[PDB]
Design a protein around this ligand. Sequence first.
Ligand SMILES: *CCC(=O)N1CC[C@@H](C2=NC(=O)c3cc(-c4ccc(F)cc4F)ccc3C2)C1
Ligand SMILES: Nc1nc2c(ncn2[C@@H]2O[C@H](COP(=O)(O)OP(=O)(O)O)[C@@H](O)[C@H]2O)c(=O)[nH]1
Ligand SMILES: [Mg+2]
Length: 170
Amino acid sequence: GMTEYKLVVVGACGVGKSALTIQLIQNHFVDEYDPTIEDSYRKQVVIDGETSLLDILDTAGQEEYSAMRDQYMRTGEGFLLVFAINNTKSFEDIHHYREQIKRVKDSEDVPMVLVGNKSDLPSRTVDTKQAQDLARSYGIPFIETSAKTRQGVDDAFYTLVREIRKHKEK
Ligand SMILES: *CCC(=O)N1CC[C@@H](C2=NC(=O)c3cc(-c4ccc(F)cc4F)ccc3C2)C1
Ligand SMILES: Nc1nc2c(ncn2[C@@H]2O[C@H](COP(=O)(O)OP(=O)(O)O)[C@@H](O)[C@H]2O)c(=O)[nH]1
Ligand SMILES: [Mg+2]
């Protein structure tokens, strides 16, 4: 058979939410994608031998409340918390996005994965160990990605699916 998963990608403007999503759905690096476009994208993949349909909300728009976004967030099964390893502000912004997920879900038990994107860049400002400290504090996995090289992209999304499977067993 197959399982559907409703996934959400959150993070600061410019961290690579769209680039990561397009790497999953189309398998290449799209370096210019309208920063204002918020949409959901469907892709059929196979995860641990099971046909898996991923619906992925690629967040954009504004920081303020959007009704359609909120109603999608409320029913999201798993969230990727994306920062860029060369942007300390995007890392500091993770707390903000995680709080909004907990506020909109009725749960302190929401599948999430912390994603350090742009791992290909030499201009790192956030140490892997700092990200590991934070993911540990949340009790969630940390995955390093490059939407440019596709390094870690399947690991980020498939790890989130594995976290949802574990949550559904409870
Ligand atoms: C380049 C522009 C861009 O990508 N952004 C501008 C606003 C930024 C933004 N990112 C988010 O991830 C986000 C998430 C939420 C939200 C809503 C509901 C919920 F349960 C959790 C959330 F994290 C609201 C606003 C934004 C704004 C991205
Ligand atoms: N070098 C590098 N650039 C990236 C990576 N991911 C995204 N980008 C670039 O970072 C910018 C923002 O990407 P985008 O997907 O629009 O970010 P979003 O605002 O979070 O949707 C664009 O110029 C992308 O080309 C990456 O992993 N490595
Ligand atoms: Mg985008």
